[PDB]
Design a protein around this nucleic acid. Structure first.
Ligand SMILES: [K+]
Ligand SMILES: [K+]
Ligand SMILES: [K+]
Ligand SMILES: [K+]
Ligand SMILES: [K+]
Ligand SMILES: [K+]
Ligand SMILES: [K+]
Ligand SMILES: [K+]
Ligand SMILES: [K+]
Ligand SMILES: [K+]
Ligand SMILES: [K+]
Ligand SMILES: [Mg+2]
Ligand SMILES: [Mg+2]
Ligand SMILES: [Mg+2]
Ligand SMILES: [Mg+2]
Ligand SMILES: [Mg+2]
Ligand SMILES: [Mg+2]
Ligand SMILES: [Mg+2]
Ligand SMILES: [Mg+2]
Ligand SMILES: [Mg+2]
Ligand SMILES: [Mg+2]
Ligand SMILES: [Mg+2]
Ligand SMILES: [Mg+2]
Ligand SMILES: [Mg+2]
Ligand SMILES: [Mg+2]
Ligand SMILES: [Mg+2]
Ligand SMILES: [Mg+2]
Ligand SMILES: [Mg+2]
Ligand SMILES: [Mg+2]
Ligand SMILES: [Mg+2]
Ligand SMILES: [Mg+2]
Ligand SMILES: [Mg+2]
Ligand SMILES: [Mg+2]
Ligand SMILES: [Mg+2]
Ligand SMILES: [Mg+2]
Ligand SMILES: [Mg+2]
Ligand SMILES: [Mg+2]
Ligand SMILES: [Mg+2]
Ligand SMILES: [Mg+2]
Ligand SMILES: [Mg+2]
Ligand SMILES: [Mg+2]
Ligand SMILES: [Mg+2]
Ligand SMILES: [Mg+2]
Ligand SMILES: [Mg+2]
Ligand SMILES: [Mg+2]
Ligand SMILES: [Mg+2]
Ligand SMILES: [Mg+2]
Ligand SMILES: [Mg+2]
Ligand SMILES: [Mg+2]
Ligand SMILES: [Mg+2]
Ligand SMILES: [Mg+2]
Ligand SMILES: [Mg+2]
Ligand SMILES: [Mg+2]
Ligand SMILES: [Mg+2]
Ligand SMILES: [Mg+2]
Ligand SMILES: [Mg+2]
Ligand SMILES: [Mg+2]
Ligand SMILES: [Mg+2]
Ligand SMILES: [Mg+2]
Ligand SMILES: [Mg+2]
Ligand SMILES: [Mg+2]
Ligand SMILES: [Mg+2]
Ligand SMILES: [Mg+2]
Ligand code: NA
Ligand code: NA
Ligand code: NA
Ligand code: NA
Ligand code: NA
Ligand code: NA
Ligand code: NA
Ligand code: NA
Ligand code: NA
Ligand code: NA
Ligand code: NA
Ligand code: NA
Ligand code: NA
Ligand code: NA
Ligand code: NA
Ligand code: NA
Length: 254
RNA sequence: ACCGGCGUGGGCUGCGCGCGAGUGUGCCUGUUUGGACCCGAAAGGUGGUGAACUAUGCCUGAACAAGGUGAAGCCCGGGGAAACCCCGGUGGAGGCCUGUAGCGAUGCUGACGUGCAAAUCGCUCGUACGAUUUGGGUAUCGGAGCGAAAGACUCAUCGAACCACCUAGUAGCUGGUUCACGUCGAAGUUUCCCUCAGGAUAGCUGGUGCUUGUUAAGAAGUAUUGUGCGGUAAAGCAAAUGAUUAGAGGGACCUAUUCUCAAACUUUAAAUGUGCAAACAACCCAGCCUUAGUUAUAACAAGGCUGGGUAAUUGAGGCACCAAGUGGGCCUUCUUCGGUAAGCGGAGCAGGCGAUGC
RNA sequence: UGCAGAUCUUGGUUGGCGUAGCAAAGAUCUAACGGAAUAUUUUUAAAUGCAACGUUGGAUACUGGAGCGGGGAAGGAUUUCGUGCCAACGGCACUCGUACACGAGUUGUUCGGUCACUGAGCACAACGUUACACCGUUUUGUUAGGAAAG
RNA sequence: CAACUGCAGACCGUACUCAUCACCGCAUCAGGUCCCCAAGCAUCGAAUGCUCUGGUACAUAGAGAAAGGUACACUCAGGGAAGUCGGCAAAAUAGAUGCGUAAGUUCGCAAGAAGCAUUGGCUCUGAGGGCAAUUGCCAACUCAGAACUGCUUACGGCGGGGAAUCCAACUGUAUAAUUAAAACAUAGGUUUGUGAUGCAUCCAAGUGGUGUAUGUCGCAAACUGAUUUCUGCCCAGUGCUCUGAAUGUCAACGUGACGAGAUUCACCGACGCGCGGGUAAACGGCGGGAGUAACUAUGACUCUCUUAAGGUAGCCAAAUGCCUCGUCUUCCAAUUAGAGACGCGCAUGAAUGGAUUAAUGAGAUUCCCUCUGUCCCGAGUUACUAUCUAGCGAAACGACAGUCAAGGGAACGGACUUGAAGGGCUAAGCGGGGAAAGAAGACCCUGUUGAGUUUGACUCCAGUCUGGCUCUGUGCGGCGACUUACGUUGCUUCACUUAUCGAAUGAAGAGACCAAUGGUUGUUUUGCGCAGUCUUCGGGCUGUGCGCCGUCUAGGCUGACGCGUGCGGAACUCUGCGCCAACGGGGUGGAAUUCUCCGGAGUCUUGUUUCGAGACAUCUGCCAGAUGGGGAGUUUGGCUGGGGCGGCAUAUCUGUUACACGACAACGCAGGUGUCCUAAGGCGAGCUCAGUGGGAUCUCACGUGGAACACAAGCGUAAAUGCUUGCUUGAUUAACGAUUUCCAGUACGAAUCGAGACUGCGAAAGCAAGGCCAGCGAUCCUUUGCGAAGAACAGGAAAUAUGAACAAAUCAUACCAGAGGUGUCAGAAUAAUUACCACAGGGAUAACUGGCUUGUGGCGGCCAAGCGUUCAUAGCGACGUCGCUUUUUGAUCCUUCGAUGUCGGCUCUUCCUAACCUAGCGCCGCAGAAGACGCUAAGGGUUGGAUUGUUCACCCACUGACAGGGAACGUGAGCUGGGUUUAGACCGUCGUGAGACAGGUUGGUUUUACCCUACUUGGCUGGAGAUUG
RNA sequence: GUGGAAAUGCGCUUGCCAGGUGACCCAUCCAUCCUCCCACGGUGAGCUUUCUUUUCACCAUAAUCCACCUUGGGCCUCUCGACGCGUUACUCGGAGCGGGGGCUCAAGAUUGAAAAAUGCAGCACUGUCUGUGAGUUCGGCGCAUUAAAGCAAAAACCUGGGGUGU
């Protein structure tokens, strides 16, 4: 047979992201001496839209700690951020929306976004529209903080990791029904080459494990093993259960 | 060399010996390998060249007559206690409608069908502000790429492109195979084979002979005489086994009969057949020899030595070596099995055609 | 080392046969001139030199501005111009020609490009891998365990 | 620095074209090819028609009413779909204005729904504005109205409409060159994996690559397919999964034993499997049989079998129903069609989605109005051809040729036999034959040929998971295990950091100074005691004490200094200021401020850029196990009245076929065989069986086998070859003895006659090395038995041989005799599918024509029991028997596989008779009328429609009548293309799957005549020895 | 350096830093240049059997520069508003509407230099024009509308903050 489409995407030839009109990665400030001992003050100058992303971004302007020049940064904006607002980043910063603080200085039960998983990662968790994390507890003996992730899982991080205060802007996006195939065309024009989608039963046996037959059907169970080789791993991968969920659903993930 | 059993025993085995026949070379024929008498696959492998056709993404440019309908927002009048509800304008939305250019290709199953054309032409037809059309640049390819998915397309080449090479690939299968005369001249049958369109093996044929003979040596698809073998035709059921009709004499039963039968019944039993013999490497008689065989021993067995006497009519007997083609058959007489039958299928004996005219 | 056939190979010849045809895009006529292409007869004038070509004037007509108009890119590369010429070629014709022959023609401080920008992207150096560089990385501010500023 | 002035301004391109002749299509080819400029009138106008400027008369022409054609050309009386598979094609509607507009609906639409009226020309009137001082002057065509007058309904351009059923929600895409669709996509719905040392995944490989410039409102992987209303039961099977490893089983690595060692054994040993849970919007599945209610009929009710569960809500002869043209209503004169109903439904049914749906559709189907040359039934006209001429000028094909009838023949002759025609050359047509041309048949079969695809085929490879070793270091504790309680050791707990791994940063400020279960051999000279124990006599090691390394500090408390806290700290308070290349101060030296250092700006480094994890990872390498159509390679018997399914005629035994020696075939007939038996083998003795009759199991007589002998059958046997009984192991060994059957005079199996040893039973002669003939197996490999102990001064008639430099003990190997098996039985290791298909061939072999046959089909004779009011025969005629035909279907396999175009209809000619009508006769159960039967007769005739692709059939009508057949099942270079029978797609059933179905459904290129003959017309010209004598 | 109360006007050099131009292409409406009609006039040809103060053609001004009334937008000042201003159109105003007077940007208009010395038509010389209406993407409304669709980048150039110089 021929190579399956799932394996062809790993070459990434015509399936890479469309990033010509993007603005760059959206990161926090670099963790330096000033943010570990005091605070830095910056001004929000612009709030802008990036194709392919649902959350608006903010351009913040700081002063260089050591040189006579100005530094411009690009971050994911929390809700309520406005142009002209003052941003404070550091250990000695107060607790307000849009400020960046170490996780150990934020009171339990507070809503945060742009959380660092490692000290210096510059933000990796809760970055999509309307998403946030919750601070559960602190442990001063070991210096670890426990959070609740948007997916429902719980994760422990060092207390020196930084986070923003508030929720990510642009929430409520998926509540509006797309109505036309034309609207889905423009949604994926900024992301990548992945739409429209052809069903596997509608292909031929040379292309997909589900192809062929005088009727359109799968002749074998769709649940496949975790050990299946590439080209065989299609369907529902390593599923613990199938069918309609009745009652409370367990937390997804490992 | 391998043994058995208690001496000048015994019985198996060798591509053994038994007064050598080999060896070198020339030439022809057969067996085998190689391109292998000549030409022919669908395939398989290695290394390269293509996205000018066409598929999809991206960068930067260009284009889309004339009409219909009339969404939000806005203005002014009315009604109402409130909540709010009505008329008229304005405005110009939509993967909206009619319709050019553009982009396509439904029907005539029209024209042409050695064409204008290796897919074109004429009317008619779909859509025509959008998931729209298009130039240049750029990015992803052959056990691969790409695909709103048709096994679509990747330079007239795709259920796996093109170029060169391995490669004169293999073919139990199809086609071909070039002078004359002369001497002979078949087979389609047996056994074994993943064998059934092919082989090996025996038979039929040719060549080369060897040993001999001149009336017959170990002669004969034929008779005679003598002496063996047989259960088919016929016959039988008043005889065994099986089937079966009806009366008679003592409803069954018994006795003697009676009609009608048999590839897998038989007392009897042909014709046509089929073994053997009818002499010289033999027989008959006489006198002897030997033995570890037989017999209680004259007598038998077996191998020898020395002298006497001995069924027509046709005619060459015996023995090797090497090799070819063939291994689809068909018809008729008589005897036959299956089938309603067949210019049907399957056998026995003989003669034919094939191979042959007159 | 001998050929009659292998849908055999390469040349040549052949009936069919002066046959099938040369039918989309409407179309030409007239006088004078040119030309070897005439007004060609010795055996009144018509019934014995037909048919066809170019230029100019006149007539008639088509394209009908999404044009058989006037300029460019890709591609072509002397097809451009003048003079001459009619063997072969323009599936009829030619005195015509993008044909043949001989000579000519393309002029920039300002026009287009380079000088002198970045884009989708490419891949020298350096490093790593590979039996073998003819391999990989090389724009998310950006090469290289990295001393790359003259 | 702004003016002016002087001088100098490099390189390459530049002609022409951009297309009905300059480019790509073999060409000056009706195909294709990007950009700019774009006039007047009609008109809504870049529609369409005509014209000024610019550009062109270039595409072979002349003459000219044959047939038949093509057309971007028309018209037809009366009827109006009667045509056809089907209204295909044509006709038809049409602009604008005023009025008017239904069911249904997601309230947007449907809608231009449907339908009605007006429209020319001419002469007038009104309304709709601007600027200057009520006046004056001036511009744009739109709309409304009136009088008069006219029509031959009169350019171009420009929707036909309505009522329903099926499918898909819609716009869109899509097999370039036969399929545009119901297929794909879509919005909506559901499920799965996953928190980055992640999930999916590329590469031969690395500090390599993609989703990821990302972060659960994300990314990756599936299924269904708008909205509305719903989505039932089943976890037994297969799959997936579990935070159950609890126990059984297992590989390397490890740990111990016997042995001299190779070897051998024991223990330990992970995931997985097993066991036990979960899961169907995972693959999938979702029952039978009796009885029963006041006429019958049905059965709410009962009983009984049985599943993992027994089809729920819905829907239906539906694109799914075989029977089937189901049954009822409606639509027509008539309906295998359509709609509405009914439902034990071969074989409907719920995200393998069920039901319903407005709007939309070059989708499939039925009816109605309008309209028509589709038809009754054809006729006339135009332009270009064909036809004749001038110029120019091919191809395909071509054994040789070209009149028929019958015969036989390879079973359909141009050539052959017999007969009958035949005059030379010829122009325009035509499509009967040349089984005409085009292509080494694509259907079917065969070959020890392939390829694409699948999986529970055979043999394997990546990937994933798991164990061991290595990478790999330092300490503190526990549980064991082994050696006399101290030494090694395997598991582990905890604390570390330097190997290693992850991340960030332009390696941009780590830690301490706050002081120890720190070090103190130190950049330029810092060590000092005590105790114990060693010494090479110089001084060390261990444990303890004191010094030194070694030290500053914003702020906040306490009484300008000390002492606790603090740990590098001076920052204005929901919305946008500047901030840089040092001021000052201390010294050194030179002067009246110039150079240097030190602070401003805290010191130090047993040293790591900083964080996280950390001796583990799954970090590197090497071994080991499991899983693994993701991938690679290969295979997937034979015979056969084609092949397949079936069967075994594939190795074998009896009777018969079989024709009186022997041999003899069929998917011929009737039956067997792969076993069974320490006795059912061997021998001696005694006895007589099956059955019958007479007497109360017992007794007597008869009894040729009519019983028995393991089994199939045949043969054989009576003081026995049978039965009972006693003793036994001849079912052992048997020096390579010979032979028969099959047969090649090979093997294997079976069997016969013997020689030797030791025996059994018999008083002996004698019988017995299985049970009589069917009951079984090569090479290579594996495995067992025999070559016991001694004797020999030497390998001998007597001691098995070898391991090749020689010796001791193991081990391996040879020679002889058996066993483990090949049933395809003279003996490869083996699953499917192809309609996407390929190649070499086969008329050795099927599907269509033809040929033989005639069971079956059809059509008739002979006899006469009966029926016919009595009466065999007016008319019929059973039980029997004799034929004919080739118009049915079978049987066969002769011709054709380098191809003979395969159903039906349309058109047209001809032949037959077994006679429906028309002609002439006879007879009747023939009064008249109307009919039955029979004979001679084939001259003439035999219809229009509804449903269906049909042939056939069945209805409605007319008629004198609406007969049956043949001609290659007449007729495709005559047509048409509805059916059948490729590739697309949907349903039902079947299959794990790819796929299958002579089940249903929808869409799907019909090529060439100019040659010979035949036929139809059209002309020229010879010929009497049918050219000569 | 300097003028004005203000909007802002007129006449030495940049190690470093910060802005701007480049730079983002619109239905509708208005609109330059341009071409197309009309009205008046000049010049030259055409028809004339009969009519036609008639039919046809032409009537042109390149770049560059000087001086300084219309339209649209931004702003200053005085008087300080609740109803008021304004578009075909979906607006706006004590965070400052409207009115008087001004500063400024963009697109046009007008006078002049160039330039009649040129060009055109007729025969050496003659003539050598303006005003209306319709169409048309330069420019303007930093424009409406879908948007889970919402600014390509850089060289080069311009100005300022500081500093230097006078
Ligand atoms: K939000
Ligand atoms: K042979
Ligand atoms: K309607
Ligand atoms: K279509
Ligand atoms: K979906
Ligand atoms: K289950
Ligand atoms: K299960
Ligand atoms: K359609
Ligand atoms: K013909
Ligand atoms: K014996
Ligand atoms: K073999
Ligand atoms: Mg990228
Ligand atoms: Mg498909
Ligand atoms: Mg597969
Ligand atoms: Mg389906
Ligand atoms: Mg070859
Ligand atoms: Mg192979
Ligand atoms: Mg439309
Ligand atoms: Mg056609
Ligand atoms: Mg297919
Ligand atoms: Mg041959
Ligand atoms: Mg002879
Ligand atoms: Mg022969
Ligand atoms: Mg020759
Ligand atoms: Mg001709
Ligand atoms: Mg014209
Ligand atoms: Mg043009
Ligand atoms: Mg010519
Ligand atoms: Mg052009
Ligand atoms: Mg052309
Ligand atoms: Mg008009
Ligand atoms: Mg027009
Ligand atoms: Mg036009
Ligand atoms: Mg008519
Ligand atoms: Mg009809
Ligand atoms: Mg039609
Ligand atoms: Mg209504
Ligand atoms: Mg209407
Ligand atoms: Mg559709
Ligand atoms: Mg097609
Ligand atoms: Mg088509
Ligand atoms: Mg039904
Ligand atoms: Mg149906
Ligand atoms: Mg009908
Ligand atoms: Mg129905
Ligand atoms: Mg369900
Ligand atoms: Mg179903
Ligand atoms: Mg459509
Ligand atoms: Mg004949
Ligand atoms: Mg002719
Ligand atoms: Mg063939
Ligand atoms: Mg074979
Ligand atoms: Mg495979
Ligand atoms: Mg077979
Ligand atoms: Mg036996
Ligand atoms: Mg045959
Ligand atoms: Mg043919
Ligand atoms: Mg034919
Ligand atoms: Mg024909
Ligand atoms: Mg199934
Ligand atoms: Mg007020
Ligand atoms: Mg007030
Ligand atoms: Mg003002
Ligand atoms: Na499938
Ligand atoms: Na399905
Ligand atoms: Na050869
Ligand atoms: Na060869
Ligand atoms: Na074999
Ligand atoms: Na053959
Ligand atoms: Na043969
Ligand atoms: Na780049
Ligand atoms: Na559309
Ligand atoms: Na679909
Ligand atoms: Na039901
Ligand atoms: Na029906
Ligand atoms: Na013809
Ligand atoms: Na065999
Ligand atoms: Na018959
Ligand atoms: Na019959």
């Amino acid at each position: 047979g021929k190579t399956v489409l799932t394996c062809r995407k790993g070459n990434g030839s015509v399936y890479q992201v469309h990033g010509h009109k993007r603005l760059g990665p959206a990161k926090l400030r670099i963790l330096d001496y000033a943010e570990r001992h005091g605070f830095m003050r910056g001004v929000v100058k612009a709030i802008e839209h990036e194709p392919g992303r649902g959350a608006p971004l903010a351009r913040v302007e700081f002063r260089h700690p050591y040189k006579y020049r100005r530094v411009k940064e690009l971050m994911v904006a929390p809700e309520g951020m406005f142009t002209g607002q003052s941003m404070l980043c550091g250990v000695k910063a107060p607790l307000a929306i849009g400020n960046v603080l170490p996780l150990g200085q934020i009171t339990e039960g507070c809503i945060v976004c742009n959380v660092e998983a490692k000290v210096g990662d510059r933000g990796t968790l809760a970055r999509a529209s309307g998403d946030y994390c919750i601070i559960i507890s602190h442990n001063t003996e070991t210096g670890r903080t426990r959070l609740k992730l948007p997916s429902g899982q719980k994760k422990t991080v060092p207390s020196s990791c930084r986070a923003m205060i508030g929720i990510v802007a642009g929430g409520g996006r998926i509540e509006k029904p797309v109505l036309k195939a034309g609207n889905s065309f423009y949604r994926f024009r900024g992301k990548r080459n992945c739409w429209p989608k052809v069903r596997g039963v509608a292909r031929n046996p040379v292309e997909h494990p589900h192809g062929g037959g005088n009727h359109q059907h799968i002749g074998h169970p769709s649940t496949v093993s975790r050990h299946a080789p590439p080209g065989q791993k299609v369907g529902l991968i390593a599923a613990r259960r199938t069918g309609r969920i009745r009652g409370s659903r367990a937390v997804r993930g490992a």
